[PDB]
Design a protein around this nucleic acid. Structure first.
Ligand SMILES: Nc1ncnc2c1ncn2[C@H]1CC[C@@H](COP(=O)(O)OP(=O)(O)OP(=O)(O)O)O1
Ligand code: SF4
Lengths: 1140, 261, 258, 259
DNA sequence: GAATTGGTGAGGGTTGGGAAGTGGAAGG
DNA sequence: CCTTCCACTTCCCAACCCTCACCA
């Protein structure tokens, strides 16, 4: 035992010396100072008895560059529940049993959300156990936690222990939840001397932050041709980095053929990028120099891109080969999770932000693409195979590349990441390491824990997973789910405001709207704008022009007009619906728990009922057939855990194994006995939401929402400043205000992601507050609002696309559009309203808006106010210049979630779902789609529009029919490549056949498992012809062979094409040109021809036939011999209907 | 009750197997005088009528006139169980919930029985002009069946021309053209192996072959078919059973705009 | 070395395909007294028992107990190549991993020689215990095939009842119930046209009809089939190939909820 | 003008039924000598050759030798109309865009008359090579077809061996391997069971079973099939039509040297 | 230990049932 | 001795399951 304690002491000393070497002096002398809390860790310390106890080391920094540490002791604790009245006996038994293992035990009353009748004010006495160090907590919990199972299954003092809580929450996150210590704030610290706990307390007024010294670094290495590097054999060429605006480079003359010289790099005037250069004679000298320079500059923030994947496993190996222990010199060691972390500094990987927070597609998750998207300039490229020659022939260009990578890494960290991460850390207890690395669900669990502790509510334990539960009818459920977002694609083709388009309309709709114009506008002004209707001056004037334009519509519904393209969508929809109905994961109640509640009084308005659609799939097997399978498994035997071991009887296996064995064994029987393997059932259900239950979750969502609205409000204010400065032409003001615009927009997008996480969190496996119903009720309530908006807009006009948030539509040119209401109050002298907004919004006012909101008036009174609330409001984009939708190649189907929209400014506004955005889909499809969307803007008539659009596609068909005879010899190897990537290790897919697996095996046969060895393999291939009639997946050729050695290419291609008789092993012979022609044929059809024949124009492309079904229906339109019905020839004697 | 028996289920089998493919569900009208069916496509292009005289059954009773609705594919399942020589019995009761069927082997080695389930239906009823037709042709049923199948491969629609010289079927598609011609059989072994045309005046008509292909499914009910036509009005084609009565298919021709123009 | 020669070579084709769909693969057992198998389908509702006596073969040699894993799909594709008129020879070695088959045409023009790879199979096997089946029946095979095929359209499980008068099949389903009765016929011209029933006490039980459409594939083995019933005991179907062997299917009843 | 008349539909039907798998669109050539066609298959693996002499028709008018482009699947879907007994006549004018086809019931009770669009086709072709052969084998067609199908079940390709005593086939693959011999017949009673071999030198050669299993589709065309074989030169498989004509396929051997 | 959700498109391979054609056996 | 019906095998199209990445 003692040796382990001494090893923990040894590592604690090692870390204390490591950070002391980096300048973090511990506070030794009694006194008082101020500082900004940048980091912390938990560590043990020795008390006045020299007993080891657990503590947290806070790290502080100051504006003068001084730094220090403070250690604060805090006893870990958790709760146990005891049967009625046992708590004194249980605590006495535990305290004698575990004397010296436990620190203190005590009884505490806590409220618990699951307690019956709890809103009376009831609470129950949990017992806290607290320990001198977490190792005794871990031991005592491993003693206790098996013993409580029997109490659960049935229903010594240990029998009285019923349950235990919070025994798995992190220790350090306790302290920052409990004592409100939070990161990125200025604190006083007062140390009385060792006899007393330190005092730490925030000071709010020092709003400005200090500037911690930041380093970012990257490396370049040798590698084998055509293959991945290996850290044993390859060697670093150069390491490039930046500290606080100063750049540096180190280069190794063992490999780099010439000395580099210092230079400066600035793509945009903001990125000053001065780079210093040092030339070092050998790899060991390079590494030692870098280590010394880091130990000199002693950064607190250390920055990499993907650096846990490539850079650290490389530099650690190259250091250790020369005996330089990076772990001892720097401090970095690979954690158990495989992530390099350090005691003295914070480690931040930008990719783990880009992946989680950017809202970019995987197509742009590469550093170069994320830089291009966010920073607004093109980085420089080197071909990964040529760096071996570049380091020999042109060292300066390799240095320039590595510097460009350093500059991009640093400035991308600085602009987006630095504000956001610490801003979020102001409200999450966690370190900047966890808050960046942790999953977006755990963050939200922490934000909820903060409030739940402040409410003094004991947490529930994590939800425990279930396997093969039964439907009530007994069918074994494979899957349960709720029906999600609702999507429709009502129309097809093109729309433009520039061209005449036909409408038909219902006059009763106009009469209904005209009859309510004032009642709509009053609500639109007072509730949404918050300008009282008494303060507006000319309210009566505009109402008459509205009424008269509605009358002008009412008199003539059917018409030709220009269309107004409008998008009409709900803001912050699912948060707002949660707030409006006041949904909470705890608040769903059955009838029996309401019957247990003293507020269950006849006529009490507390119960709200809402409906949702459940979906579940069950296997067809009977309950009794499943019991038969189980009865047969009463004697089955199974293989050992390991080849040496004896075989295991079925009763020895884990539940996780047994459930999977049952599921397979029953699925086979089902395949035999009941031909449909799975039955899918949809069912509507209703669930009651309590309205008086504690609001902590919903108030959390309210606060987070209002924070995101803070960022959007500043975004709107600076948008005002920007638009003024742009109209005036104030370049310095435009530059500053545009920087503020970017900063607040990216912040509000990140908050959008985290805020939305609050909804889906409720479904996460294991979540503490878990419930499926609150995830369905929101989806269904979001499907209603959009469906009713489709009803209304379909009466006035023609909706064109739906999704979960809002409608895309065309409206007739005569519609009221926009108005300005003038005001006496100079604070808001002009209020602008769009009528389509209030037109939709009033239906949400009338139907949806909540009329059962309740709030506690006085905790001692047990009395509540009743209130009404709505926050669901439509808002309006555009109007837009043009819209295009594709249509399905199959009859009766329409392509959802694929479309393109253009701003009145005349440039691409949105382009959603098409292959251009997808990662690595066939490049030719990308280039064709890109060109045709821009081509749709040309022309002025549908005959012109489709006649021009056809000319873009026809050129690419002419390319394919010409076998690209004019295309440069290298270009096909890119243009024709698929780049389909593969997630898992090639072992794990088993037998399943697909072209990715096929070509990964085809490479493994060429270069061995050194490529296969690890997850995330990438593939590039073409599909060949010559093994005729072989199924498609068996003609795949990876591009690699066209760069392999000729005598090996003419071996592997001879094998794979089953032919030496192929006289020329040339891609142009090898390509399956007709397959690529069919691929493009489909890509042209879905956009340029089927969406033509639906718009009553002819087929605009000769080369591509319609599908024969459409050819038949279109030709049947076009002949004189009309098919009569028999009802036109024979007299109808009557209608008759038959009853059984 | 209703109750009937039939000498050979082959007739009723070929009936159901000719109805099932065209009309999905239909209702029978039932009486002491027999059984009748009239029903129309959900396409409303074409129409079907069947008459089964009581005197054709082996034994027949009905207590009171009734009607009942049946899904024809569901019934047509069960009759697949009846053997070619089996003797079949049908029953129903005035509560009209179910149709009982029983099959007996000729040697009474075996009994098979089933309880088919009725359904509720709506229909619109069409009067028949009962005119005489300006042309009638009577023809070997299999030869008309093959004429239909062959031309259905040539194109989507047939043109029918009837003249004193004979009858011609024609069609075309993007492949080209096809013609089939018949003329009066001068020397007749028996009328069941002869084509005969009778006319008032010549006629020309056009029809969509997809329906004719479903009409020809009745071929195994008789050696010969009759077709009756008059200008600008529905074509009627008929198969008849010597015992039971008749099955008639009615189709409305296509017509030109120039009439309306 | 095991070797044997069978003059009525079609039997191997028939008896193999009567299992091709029911069991994928099995370890065929060979001894001086014949070629044998017991096996179970992976659904574990049913057991298969097969034996061909060496006395029936035109030639037979066996010098040790031999076991050989075969996937029946492969031999099924091989036995597609033999005509029903051909004479079959089978050969195996205790020191090799391949089975050899030779086909000989009665005209002596045509011969064939197929080699297929054995596979490495072992299975833990119980002998089916002796049973006093309280009721036993013999029927012409095509009649039982038609009964099960026709009832399969009405539904997926059949209730069979036996009584002093004979047997009844009955079924229920969404399209409505139905029944078939076979009484004990009085007199018959030949056994291939005859039904025979013995019943010690009345029994009725429910059987999963979707399985019997597998067993009925044995029909070309025999003009007649033997069946047996008892309470809470797998029903027997038995085919016998002249006097030279047997194939039997044992199938459990559906365990009712009550 | 061109026309010709024939009492049999069966030959013209089953020729189309044999071609439809190998060739989609073809140019026929037409002469006083009859109808001829040679054409590479769509995969260019093998070459079809066919002719029907004019002596085989009931009557034949051809004022000038000519060539005509036609679509095989369409002509098949027309010829499926004729009954096997029906009298066939084919005709075209010297400048028609169309081929006209007439089918009559033997009793003349019925007439049927169809038209197909011509198309403009030309194809680049060699004068077909022929030689004396190392081996020639005569077999009943149905047995050769069945053997080829059974070998295709076991594997991808068949290797053939010829010798004085008999003809042997072998194949190998993931199922194992299979070997077959047909003996020379001891005394031919009539050719409809006769296997006979001409043997200048023993030969062994390998071919892909897919294309043989397409060539076999002509099996209804004649009860006897003939194989013509030598090393380092195409196999030819030949069927003969009445006396009037012949159908042949040319295929190269799957080179074993690659192994 | 650590872990937000459901709906959709595109591509490629596998599985079931119905329709067509041929050969064998029974009926007259 | 010839024609029709039953049974078996082959061929063709629709539906269902696997992956990955985007739209919310
Ligand atoms: N990451 C996510 N996780 C779960 N559901 C999500 C989601 N993103 C969207 N949804 C679902 C639920 C919400 C819905 C999309 O609406 P928003 O509230 O995201 O608002 P929007 O219009 O995108 O932006 P705003 O107007 O607030 O600025 O889709
Ligand atoms: S909804 Fe009303 S009755 Fe039900 S638990 Fe809540 S307060 Fe009690």
């Amino acid at each position: 035992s003692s040796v382990s304690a001494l090893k923990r002491l040894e590592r604690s000393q090692w870390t204390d010396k490591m950070d002391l070497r980096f300048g973090f002096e511990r506070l030794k002398e009694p006194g008082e100072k101020t500082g900004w809390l940048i980091n912390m860790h938990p560590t043990e310390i020795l008390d006045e008895d020299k007993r080891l106890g657990s503590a947290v080391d806070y790290y502080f920094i100051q504006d003068d560059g001084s730094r220090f540490k403070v250690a604060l002791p805090y006893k870990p604790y958790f709760y146990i529940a005891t049967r009625k009245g046992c708590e004194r006996e249980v605590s006495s038994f535990l305290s004698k049993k575990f004397q010296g293992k436990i620190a203190k035990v005590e009884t505490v009353p806590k409220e618990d959300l699951d307690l019956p009748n709890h809103l009376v004010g009831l609470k129950r006495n949990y017992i806290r156990l607290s320990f001198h160090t977490v190792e005794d907590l871990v031991k005592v919990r491993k003693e206790i936690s098996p013993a409580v199972k029997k109490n659960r299954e049935q229903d010594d003092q240990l029998d009285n222990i019923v349950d235990m809580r919070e025994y798995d929450v992190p220790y350090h996150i306790r302290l920052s939840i409990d004592l409100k210590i939070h990161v990125a704030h200025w604190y006083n610290v007062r140390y009385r001397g060792n006899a007393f706990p330190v005092e730490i307390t925030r000071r709010d007024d020092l709003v400005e932050r200090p500037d911690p010294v930041v380093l970012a670094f990257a490396i370049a290495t040798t590698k084998l041709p055509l293959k991945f590097p290996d850290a044993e054999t390859d060697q670093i060429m150069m390491i490039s980095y930046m500290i606080d605006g100063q750049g540096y480079l180190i280069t190794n003359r063992e490999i780099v053929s010439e000395d580099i010289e210092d230079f400066e790099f600035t793509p945009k005037p903001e990125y000053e990028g001065p780079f210093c250069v040092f030339n070092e004679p050998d790899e060991a000298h390079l590494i030692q120099r870098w280590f010394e320079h880091v130990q000199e500059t002693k950064p607190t923030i250390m920055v990499t891109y993907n650096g846990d994947f490539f850079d650290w496993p490389f530099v650690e190996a190259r250091a250790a080969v020369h005996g330089l222990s990076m772990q001892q010199e720097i401090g970095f060691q690979k954690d158990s999770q495989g992530e390099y972390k350090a005691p003295q500094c914070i480690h931040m990987d930008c990719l783990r932000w880009v992946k989680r927070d950017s809202y970019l597609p995987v197509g742009s998750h590469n550093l170069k693409a994320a830089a291009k998207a966010k920073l607004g300039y093109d980085p420089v490229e080197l071909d990964p195979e040529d760096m071996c020659r570049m380091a020999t022939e042109q060292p300066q260009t390799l240095a320039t590349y590595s510097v460009s990578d350093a500059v991009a890494t640093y400035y991308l960290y600085m602009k987006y990441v630095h504000p956001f991460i610490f801003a979020l850390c102001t409200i999450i207890p966690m370190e900047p390491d966890e808050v960046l690395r942790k999953g977006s669900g755990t963050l939200c669990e922490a934000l909820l824990m903060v409030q739940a502790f402040h409410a003094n509510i004991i947490f529930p334990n994590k939800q425990e997973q279930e396997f093969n539960k039964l439907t009530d009818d007994g069918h074994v459920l494979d899957s349960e789910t709720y029906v999600g977002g609702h999507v429709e694609a009502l129309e097809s083709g093109v729309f433009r405001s520039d061209i005449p388009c036909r409408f038909r309309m219902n006059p009763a709709a106009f009469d209904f709207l005209l009859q309510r114009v004032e009642k709509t506008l009053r609500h639109a002004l007072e509730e949404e704008e918050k300008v009282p209707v008494e303060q507006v001056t000319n309210f009566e004037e505009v109402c008459d022009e509205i009424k008269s334009k509605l009358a002008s519509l009412k008199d003539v519904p059917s018409r030709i007009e220009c269309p107004l393209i409008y998008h009409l969508d709900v803001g912050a929809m699912y948060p707002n619906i949660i707030l409006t109905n006041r949904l909470q994961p705890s608040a769903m109640v059955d009838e029996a728990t309401c019957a247990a509640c003293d507020f269950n009084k006849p006529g009490a308005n507390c119960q709200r009922k809402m409906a949702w659609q459940w979906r579940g799939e069950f296997m067809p097997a009977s309950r009794s057939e499943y019991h038969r399978i189980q009865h047969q498994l009463e004697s089955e035997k199974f293989p050992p855990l390991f080849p040496e071991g004896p075989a295991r009887a079925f009763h020895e296996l884990s539940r996780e194994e047994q459930a999977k064995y049952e599921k397979r064994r029953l699925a086979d029987y089902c395949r035999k006995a009941y031909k449909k393997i799975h039955i899918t059932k949809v069912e509507e259900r209703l669930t009651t939401i309590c309205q008086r239950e504690n609001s902590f979750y919903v108030d959390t969502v309210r606060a987070f929402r209002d924070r995101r609205y803070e960022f959007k409000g500043l975004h709107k204010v600076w948008k005002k400043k920007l638009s003024a400065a742009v109209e005036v032409g104030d370049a310095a003001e435009v530059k500053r205000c545009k920087n503020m615009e970017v900063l607040y927009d990216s912040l509000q997008l990140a908050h959008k992601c985290i805020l939305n996480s609050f909804y889906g969190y409720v479904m996460r496996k294991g979540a503490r507050w878990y419930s499926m119903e609150m995830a369905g009720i929101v989806c269904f309530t979001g499907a209603n609002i959009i469906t009713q908006a489709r009803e209304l807009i379909e009466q006035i006009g023609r909706p064109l696309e739906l999704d979960t948030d809002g409608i895309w539509c065309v409206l007739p040119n005569s519609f009221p559009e926009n108005f300005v209401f003038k005001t006496t109050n100079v604070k808001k002298p002009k209020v602008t309203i769009s009528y389509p907004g209030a037109m939709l919004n009033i239906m949400v006012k009338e139907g949806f808006t909540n009329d059962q909101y309740q709030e506690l008036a006085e905790p001692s009174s047990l009395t509540y106010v009743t209130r009404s609330e709505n926050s669901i409001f439509f808002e309006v984009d555009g109007p837009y210049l043009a819209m295009i939708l594709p249509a399905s190649k199959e009859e009766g189907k329409k392509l959802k979630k694929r479309y393109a929209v253009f701003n009145e400014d005349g440039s691409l506004a949105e382009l959603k779902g098409f292959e251009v955005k997808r990662r690595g889909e066939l490049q030719l499809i990308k280039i064709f789609q890109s060109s045709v969307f821009e081509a749709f803007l040309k022309g002025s008539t549908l005959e012109e529009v489709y006649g021009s659009v056809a000319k873009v596609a026809d050129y690419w068909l002419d390319v394919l029919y010409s076998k690209a005879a004019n295309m440069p010899d290298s270009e096909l190897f890119e243009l024709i490549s698929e780049n389909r990537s593969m997630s898992r290790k090639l072992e794990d897919y088993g037998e399943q056949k697909s072209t990715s697996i096929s070509t990964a095996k085809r490479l493994a046969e060429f270069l061995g498992d050194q490529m296969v060895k690890d997850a995330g393999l990438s593939c590039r291939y073409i599909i060949s012809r010559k093994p005729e009639g072989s199924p498609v997946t068996e003609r795949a050729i990876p591009l690699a062979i066209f760069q392999a050695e000729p005598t090996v290419r003419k071996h592997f291609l001879r094998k794979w094409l089953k032919s030496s008789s192929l006289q020329d092993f040339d891609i142009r012979a090898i390509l399956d040109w007709d397959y690529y022609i069919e691929r493009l044929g489909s890509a042209i059809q879905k956009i340029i021809t089927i969406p033509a024949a639906l718009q009553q124009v002819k087929n605009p492309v000769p080369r591509v036939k319609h599908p024969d079904w459409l050819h038949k229906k279109l030709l049947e339109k076009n002949d004189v011999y009309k098919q009569k019905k028999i009802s036109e020839l024979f007299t109808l004697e009557g209608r008759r209907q038959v009853t059984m | 009750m209703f109750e009937a028996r039939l000498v050979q289920g082959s007739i009723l089998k070929k009936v159901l197997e000719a109805l099932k493919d065209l009309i999905n569900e239909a209702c029978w009208d039932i009486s002491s005088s027999g059984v009748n069916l009239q029903s129309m496509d959900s396409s409303h292009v074409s129409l079907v009528q069947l008459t089964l005289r009581s005197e054709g059954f082996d034994t027949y009773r009905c207590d009171r006139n009734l009607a009942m609705g049946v899904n024809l594919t569901s019934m047509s399942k069960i009759l697949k169980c009846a053997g070619n020589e089996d003797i079949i019995t049908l029953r129903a009761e005035d509560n009209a919930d179910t149709l009982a069927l029983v099959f007996e082997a000729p040697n009474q080695e075996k009994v098979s029985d089933y309880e088919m389930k009725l359904m509720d239906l709506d229909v619109e009823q069409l009067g028949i002009p009962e005119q005489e037709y300006s042309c009638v042709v009577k023809m070997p049923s299999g030869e008309f069946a093959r004429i239909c199948r062959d031309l259905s491969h040539i194109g989507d629609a047939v043109v029918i021309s009837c003249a004193k010289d004979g009858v011609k079927f024609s069609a075309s598609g993007e492949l080209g053209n096809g013609n089939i011609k018949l003329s009066q059989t001068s020397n007749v072994d028996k009328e069941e192996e002869a084509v005969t045309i009778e006319m008032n005046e010549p006629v020309q008509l056009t029809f969509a072959l997809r329906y004719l292909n479903f009409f020809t499914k009745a071929t195994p009910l008789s050696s010969t078919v009759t077709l009756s036509m008059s200008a600008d009005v529905p074509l009627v084609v008929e198969y008849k059973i010597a015992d039971m009565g008749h099955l008639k298919y009615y189709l409305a021709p296509k017509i030109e705009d120039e009439e309306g123009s």
